[PDB]
Amino acid sequence: STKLEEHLEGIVNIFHQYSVRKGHFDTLSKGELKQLLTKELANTIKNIKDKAVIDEIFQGLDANQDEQVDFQEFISLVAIALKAAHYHTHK
Amino acid sequence: STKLEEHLEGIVNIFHQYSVRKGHFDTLSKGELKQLLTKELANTIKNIKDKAVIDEIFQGLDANQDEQVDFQEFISLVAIALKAAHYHTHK
Numbered sequence: 001s002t003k004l005e006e007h008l009e010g011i012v013n014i015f016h017q018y019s020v021r022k023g024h025f026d027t028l029s030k031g032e033l034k035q036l037l038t039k040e041l042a043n044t045i046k047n048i049k050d051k052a053v054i055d056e057i058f059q060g061l062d063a064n065q066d067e068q069v070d071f072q073e074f075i076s077l078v079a080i081a082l083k084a085a086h087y088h089t090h091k
Numbered sequence: 092s093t094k095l096e097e098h099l100e101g102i103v104n105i106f107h108q109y110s111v112r113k114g115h116f117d118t119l120s121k122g123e124l125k126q127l128l129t130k131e132l133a134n135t136i137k138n139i140k141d142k143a144v145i146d147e148i149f150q151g152l153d154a155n156q157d158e159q160v161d162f163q164e165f166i167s168l169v170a171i172a173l174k175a176a177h178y179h180t181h182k
């Protein structure tokens with residue numbers, strides 16, 4: 001409804017377009033995370049292509065080591081991307 | 092440049108339209124946070140026009156106790172609001 005709320009809805013929508021693909025409809029496997037990062041965060045994260053970088057993000061986000069990133073764990077990634085977007089407006 | 096990246100930039104933009112108003116240009120006073128919450132999140136968080144409700148959210152954000160919500164602290168509100176918006180798409 002407000003522009004902020006539309007941004008919140010959009011982030012949720014984008015999570016879901018990747019989370020539905022395989023396995024649990026509401027969590028991201030590593031493959032789904034990889035597709036999300038590659039496509040949707042291509043200009044935000046350095047070395048986004050490199051394989052090592054994705055295994056390491058994935059391990060960092062998977063706080064309970066069940067090999068899935070749930071919505072709550074995914075929020076840590078949004079936090080990282082928000083800080084960088086903030087940095088980017090000033091630099 | 093991606094849709095996700097635009098949403099993240101849009102969130103920063105909205106933080107700045109309130110943070111520049113008074114005192115430090117890059118942090119939110121309780122006054123600026125009040126305005127932001129009531130105008131931009133009016134449909135996302137329960138009963139946000141009560142005085143008691145605004146005060147609670149400010150204190151919870153201001154984690155080092157310096158009377159400002161800087162952008163890093165503001166990311167916690169974004170996290171709260173994302174979880175709320177996620178809960179609402181399924182409920």
Ligand SMILES: [Ca+2]
Nearest residue numbers: 019022024027
């Ligand atoms: Ca999945």
Ligand SMILES: [Ca+2]
Nearest residue numbers: 062066068069
């Ligand atoms: Ca997990």
Ligand SMILES: [Ca+2]
Nearest residue numbers: 110113115118
């Ligand atoms: Ca300010």
Ligand SMILES: [Ca+2]
Nearest residue numbers: 153159160161
């Ligand atoms: Ca503070």
Ligand SMILES: [Cu+2]
Nearest residue numbers: 016026071177
């Ligand atoms: Cu969901």
Ligand SMILES: [Cu+2]
Nearest residue numbers: 086107117162
């Ligand atoms: Cu700023």
